[PDB]
């Protein structure tokens, strides 16, 4: 009765950051030792939780968020951060209580392309908000009528993700673990 963390971390293909996947985790036991003993990850930053002691606590619900960004943009996956990814694609709350895990995936997500991110938006995303709109972004006063042109921009932009790029430009698969305890039956326990 183990939690399906493998289906998230070891997924064959990840979602674009503007359309980040979220996996609800409940009514299961999780051996986090696999996650926190690994050497594949390049960054594993936790806020308000201790991953090395995650095997001795029960949460009510755990959310796993999956997406792909650039190496330069990994720092934007953190509370109180600003930038195109944080403002327009994926935003963490200031009181975030969870772990942010990222690793280089230049071998899996770079071709000698399809991952996208939102480039234009009127206002910043609220924390844990998902926006998949493809409506033509109206940069002027004239309505766009859903066609690209002057003062009418497509809101999404495609990453490069080519094997010859620098490390900061290479794709990085990111999994964000969200933990909530609250006052409720805690049905997500460790191997305790």
């Amino acid at each position: 009765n183990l939690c399906p963390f493998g289906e998230v971390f070891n997924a064959t293909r990840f979602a674009s950051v503007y359309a980040w996947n979220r996996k609800r985790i409940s009514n299961c036991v999780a051996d986090y030792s696999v996650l926190y003993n690994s050497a594949s990850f390049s960054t594993f930053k936790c806020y308000g939780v201790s991953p090395t002691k995650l095997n001795d606590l029960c949460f009510t619900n755990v959310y796993a968020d999956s997406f792909v960004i650039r190496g330069d943009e990994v720092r934007q996956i953190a509370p109180g951060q600003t930038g195109k990814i944080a403002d327009y694609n994926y935003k963490l709350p200031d009181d975030f209580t969870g772990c942010v895990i990222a690793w280089n995936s230049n071998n899996l997500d770079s071709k000698v392309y399809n991952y996208l991110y939102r480039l234009f938006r009127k206002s910043n995303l609220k924390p844990f908000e998902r926006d998949i709109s493809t409506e033509i972004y109206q940069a002027g006063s004239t309505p766009c009528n859903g066609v690209e042109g002057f003062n009418c921009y497509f809101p999404l932009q495609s990453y490069g993700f080519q094997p010859t790029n620098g490390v900061g430009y290479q794709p990085y698969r990111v999994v964000v673990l969200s933990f909530e305890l609250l006052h409720a039956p805690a049905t997500v326990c460790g191997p305790k």
Partner: antibody
Framework: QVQLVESGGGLIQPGGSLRLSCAAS????????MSWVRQAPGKGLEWVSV???????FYADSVKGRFTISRDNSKSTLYLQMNSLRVEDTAVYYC???????????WGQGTLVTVSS | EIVLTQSPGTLSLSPGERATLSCRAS??????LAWYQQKPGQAPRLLIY???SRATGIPDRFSGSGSGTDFTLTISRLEPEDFAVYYC?????????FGQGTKLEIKR
């Protein structure tokens, strides 16, 4: 048609304050990326600061903590508040409409800021 | 930061010839480059974005090339008004940087 007209440049004592303005026409200022770019006399182009469509602001290291970029939707104007000015800040400051924080597809005529005692 | 080197520093050509300007980068930027033309007493005007795509209203004579760390701006059939300073700007890694420019003179 797109117009970018700047004003506010002039002579200012070192350590003083100055505010540049940039009136924009032909696009909505609040829905676009806006940047200030300065060119020193006889030198190249240097990026100063940028304000995102959502309102996030970013600045260069040489001006961080001193300069402040802002927009006025009602007046359709972009501002650059320059405080604690230095002699090295003497340059021709351009107003540029920024496309997705990448490149500048429209430029203003430029205004000259001179810092000297 | 990232430094963009522009070769040559200056260049003089007769009207009706081909201009070859070169921009080199300290790090890989993957075609995230732009080219600007600045006539004297005026502001820079965008010419080419994406290192290959032409801006609106730019004549067909202007053409970008290259990728990675080496880029080339080629302007053919030079007219008496196509001589000015040209800059390359990268927008792959923050902060964005420019080049020292390349003066262009009409030979007579």
């Amino acid at each position: 048609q797109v117009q970018l007209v700047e004003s506010g440049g002039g002579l200012i004592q070192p350590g003083g304050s100055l505010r540049l303005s940039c009136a924009a026409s032909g696009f909505t200022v609040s829905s676009n990326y806006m940047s200030w770019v300065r060119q020193a006399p006889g030198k190249g182009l240097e990026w100063v600061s940028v304000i995102y469509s959502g309102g996030s602001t970013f600045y260069a290291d040489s001006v961080k903590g001193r300069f402040t970029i802002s927009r006025d939707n009602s007046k359709s104007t972009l501002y650059l508040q320059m405080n604690s000015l230095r002699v090295e800040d003497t340059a021709v400051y351009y107003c540029a409409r920024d496309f997705g924080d990448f490149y500048f597809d429209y430029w203003g005529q430029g205004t000259l800021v001179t810092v000297s005692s | 930061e990232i430094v963009l080197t522009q070769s040559p520093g200056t260049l003089s050509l007769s009207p009706g010839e081909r201009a070859t300007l070169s921009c080199r980068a300290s790090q890989s930027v993957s075609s995230y480059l732009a080219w600007y033309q600045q006539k004297p007493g005026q502001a820079p005007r965008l010419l080419i974005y994406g290192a290959s795509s032409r801006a609106t209203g730019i004549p067909d004579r202007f053409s970008g090339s290259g990728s990675g760390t080496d880029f080339t701006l080629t302007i053919s059939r030079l007219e008496p008004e196509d001589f000015a300073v040209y800059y390359c700007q990268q927008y792959g890694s923050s902060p964005r940087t420019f080049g020292q420019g390349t003066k262009l003179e009409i030979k007579r």
